[PDB]
């Protein structure tokens, strides 16, 4: 679990969005596993606007942060799950690092701010949904 809180927006994994997220929907994209909802309170986070390919992510299944080198956002095949049919997930970045079911929502940050959130993983990989191209989150 986990979310990004920036301005009057809450960014979550689309497959973990709550009834309240859907009732306050701003934007969602199944191909990216992202959903953004509106908030009444001002958020605590700021978004990176950069091309960093290294950073640190929070891994809830270890209660620890780990450093990672990750690939540039791209279209990657993701096997079927209870949440989605087998499909290509766009704007996804992969890295070697521990993740297991439950780690989705953990934040990836570089020196510039929030880069994205955990969205996939397994077998010593961890995949992050990029948010750096969503410029409207800043206004
Ligand atoms: N974190 C993590 C992790 C590690 C091992 C396994 C998993 C589960 C996983 O990959 N998916 C299930 C939920 C929806 C996902 C998607 N974006 O399509 C795919 N996550
Ligand atoms: Zn950066």
Curated annotation (Swiss-Prot):
Subunit note: Homodimer.
Protein source organism: Coxsackievirus A16 (strain G-10)
Record: residues binding Zn(2+) 1: 50, 52, 110, 112
First-to-last residue of the parent protein present: 869 to 1007 of 2193
Function noted in UniProt: Cysteine protease that cleaves viral polyprotein and specific host proteins. It is responsible for the autocatalytic cleavage between the P1 and P2 regions, which is the first cleavage occurring in the polyprotein. Also cleaves the host translation initiation factor EIF4G1, in order to shut down the capped cellular mRNA translation. Inhibits the host nucleus-cytoplasm protein and RNA trafficking by cleaving host members of the nuclear pores. Counteracts stress granule formation probably by antagonizing its assembly or promoting its dissassembly.
Transmembrane segments: none
Catalytic activity, as annotated: Selective cleavage of Tyr-|-Gly bond in the picornavirus polyprotein
Active site per UniProt: 15 (for protease 2a activity), 33 (for protease 2a activity), 104 (for protease 2a activity)
Name assigned to this protein: Protease 2A
